[PDB]
């Protein structure tokens, strides 16, 4: 189910090439014939509007799109009733006999799980969790527990739920704590890192992504090649340059990801160019990272520009440590940036107190701002006194 | 938490970033 | 099918060439693992002169 | 031409350079950068790039 959500996401906003939606149209048209995408197929028009969302032959009659294959027809209408019969009506008579005759426990619980998976493709989340609750009482070992974490996860990836998914996953894992192997534990931890993209936790998104193995593949929830982009972009976003050398640039699993798929261009281009202190070739590497990774991915679109901005401020800070005073013919000449545009970069970064630096107008000498004898023993030393005083006087003033 | 979330920037998207590639050959 | 289903000494020949795959890929976990299985099993089977020296 | 020795060329380049840099760093600092390149024997832009890298 993830292969359709990744390709059809290009139908939202494409400012570069139309062929990106044309190549993705072949994947959407092929999957809707074998299986019924109607809950997600209709959700495309109800998600984003005034781009591809206005074209429909059923709910609202309009044409706005670069692709005409998103409109309903008589073929998908007949296939919608076929899924409600073979997957539901035919199984409903078989599962009813097992409930009355009382044959087995785990064998019958698997029938309710397979039935609940059919409602995910149909789009009914009420009966999907209802049949799961009946099989939850019959489940004992971890064999039936693996499909429980996916049912809640299908709301986030498929139904696009950023709220009720995180609360339900924490309740199931807390009631019965097993975890299986590391790949089963990733299914909980992968969403925790992805959920940080919606609430904008910044570096807290890659906390559980870096520790997760590169062999994690959820199929319908997520694919093998796509999950490699989340750990590569957020991994460099969180871990500093010192951690990039012993973890990112040299890894057994990570280096095998970019060799198979060349669409990453993160753990290599953004690293090796930084290790060589070359910012001239480092600038165009952000194009393939933004255009070919962040844009086509769904959850990576929540931030977008927020990614490459903090990556530039991070690499500009490393240049300030190698020289006390910089020159105008160094940053603003060989690296490709321009005096007018480069001044807008650090122009808003300095008052944010994210990076301290001095930019010159006439002579064009960039000076590195250092606390010198201040460091962390001046402002950060006295901040902990009053910072903890509020929480210390919280229960002291009001007693109980 | 200050000058961060909703205000954002509203620049550095495409036109400004794509212009910096032409400056390399103009030197 | 390589474990005791076809050819016992053929393992070291496969594990040796497998280490060269991850060598150019800068993967030291799979290269040292395939070499360990090749050097450990080297006493359990036979290899020619070019394989032992490699 | 060899790929394995190519990885060691930068290691030997930085080894002989670091030994020459320690001769400059051992006395007091604040010397002319153009005088530093004359001691190393390379161009000014070549020295400033490698010295700031360490």
* Apparent shape of chain B: elongated
User: How would you classify the quaternary structure?
Assistant: part of a larger assembly
Helix fraction of chain B, binned, reads 25-40%
Hey, which two chains have the biggest interface?
A-B, 21 and 18 residues
Q: Which strand-content bin applies to the residues of chain C?
A: under 5%
Per DSSP E runs of 2 or more residues, the count of β-strands of chain B stands at 0
Question: What is the alpha-carbon Rg of chain C in Å?
Answer: 11 Å
**Rg of chain B:** 14 Å
- Largest sheet: number of strands, sense, barrel closure of chain B: none
Could you give a short account of the major beta sheet of chain C?
none
The helix-and-strand class of chain B reads mainly alpha
Q: List SSEs of chain B in N-to-C order.
A: HH
Count of DSSP helices of chain C?
A: 3
Count of distinct strands of chain C: 0
**Overall SS class of chain C:** mainly alpha
Mass-distribution shape of chain C = globular
Beta-strand portion of chain B reads under 5%
Q: Roughly how many Å apart are the termini of chain C?
A: 25 Å
Portion in helices of chain C: 55-70%
- Helical segment tally of chain B? 2
Order of helices and strands of chain C: HHH
Describe the structure.
- This is part of a larger assembly, with one copy of chain A (400 residues), one copy of chain B (27 residues) and two copies of chain C (54 residues).
- Chain A has helices at residues 2-7, 19-34, 38-47, 74-101, 106-122, 125-138, 146-157, 164-175, 182-199, 207-211, 224-238, 241-248, 254-260, 269-275, 282-294, 305-322, 328-334, 339-349, 379-392, 394-397; strands at residues 357-358, 367-368.
- With 400 residues, chain A is mainly alpha-helical.
- Chain A has two domains: 1-322, no CATH class; 323-369, no CATH class.
- In chain A, β1 (357-358) and β2 (367-368) form a beta hairpin.
- The longest helix of chain A has 28 residues, at 74-101.
- With 54 residues, chain C is an all-alpha fold.
- Chain C has helices spanning 10-24, 28-40, 49-53.
- The radius of gyration of chain C is 11 Å and the shape is globular.
- Chain C starts with 9 loop residues before the first helix and ends with a helix.
- The relative contact order of chain C is 0.19.
- Classes of the chains: A mainly alpha (400), B mainly alpha (27), C mainly alpha (54).
- Chains in contact: A-B, A-C, A-D.
- The PDB classes it as hydrolase.
């Amino acid at each position: 189910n993830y292969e359709v959500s990744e390709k059809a996401f290009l139908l939202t906003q494409s400012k570069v090439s139309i062929e990106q939606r044309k190549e993705a149209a072949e994947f959407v048209l092929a999957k809707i014939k074998e299986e019924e995408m109607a809950p997600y197929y209709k959700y495309l028009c109800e998600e984003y509007l005034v781009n591809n969302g206005q074209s429909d032959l059923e709910h609202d009659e309009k044409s706005d799109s670069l692709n005409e294959w998103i409109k309903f027809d008589q073929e998908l209408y007949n296939e919608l009733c076929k899924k409600n019969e073979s997957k539901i009506k035919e199984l409903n008579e078989k599962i009813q006999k097992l409930e009355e005759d009382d044959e087995g426990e785990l064998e019958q619980a698997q029938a309710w799980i397979n039935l609940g998976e059919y409602y995910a493709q149909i789009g009914d989340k009420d009966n999907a969790e209802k049949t799961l609750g009946k099989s939850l009482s019959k489940a004992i070992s971890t064999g039936a527990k693996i499909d429980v974490m996916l049912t809640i996860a299908r709301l986030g990836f498929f139904y696009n739920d950023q709220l009720y998914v995180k609360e339900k996953l924490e309740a199931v894992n807390s009631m019965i704590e097993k975890g299986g192997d590391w790949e089963r534990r990733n299914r909980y931890k992968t969403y925790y890192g992805i959920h940080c993209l919606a609430v904008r936790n910044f570096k807290e998104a890659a906390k559980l992504l870096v520790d997760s193995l590169a062999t994690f593949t959820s199929i319908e929830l997520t694919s093998y090649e796509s999950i490699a982009t989340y750990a590569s972009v957020t991994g460099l976003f969180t871990l500093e340059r010192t951690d990039l050398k012993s973890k990112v640039i040299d890894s057994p699993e990570l280096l095998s990801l970019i060799s198979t798929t060349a669409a990453l261009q993160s753990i290599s281009s953004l690293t090796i160019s930084l290790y060589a202190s070359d910012y001239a070739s480092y600038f165009p590497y952000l194009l393939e990272t933004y255009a070919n990774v962040l844009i086509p991915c769904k959850y990576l679109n929540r931030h977008a520009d927020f990614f490459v901005r903090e990556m530039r401020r991070k690499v500009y800070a490393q240049l300030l440590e190698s020289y006390k005073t910089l020159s105008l013919k160094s940053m603003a000449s060989a690296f490709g940036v321009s005096v007018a545009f480069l001044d807008n970069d650090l122009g808003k970064f300095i008052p944010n107190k994210q990076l301290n630096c001095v930019i010159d107008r006439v002579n064009g000498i960039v000076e590195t701002n250092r606390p010198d004898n201040k460091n962390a023993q001046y402002h950060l030393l006295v901040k902990q006194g009053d910072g903890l005083l509020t929480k210390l006087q919280k229960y002291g003033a009001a007693v109980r | 938490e200050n000058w961060d979330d909703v205000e954002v920037d509203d620049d550095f998207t495409n036109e400004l970033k794509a212009e910096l590639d032409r400056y390399k050959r103009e030197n | 099918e390589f474990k005791k289903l076809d050819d016992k000494p053929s393992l070291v020949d496969v594990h040796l060439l497998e280490s060269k795959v991850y060598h150019k890929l800068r993967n030291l976990a799979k290269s040292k693992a395939s070499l360990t299985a090749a050097r450990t099993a080297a006493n359990s089977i036979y290899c020619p002169t070019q394989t032992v020296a490699e | 031409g060899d790929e394995l020795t190519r990885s060691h060329f930068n290691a030997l380049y930085d080894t002989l350079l670091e030994s020459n840099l320690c001769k400059i760093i051992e006395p007091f600092e604040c010397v002319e950068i153009s005088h530093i390149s004359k001691i190393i024997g390379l161009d000014t832009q070549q020295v400033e790039g490698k010295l700031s890298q360490m």
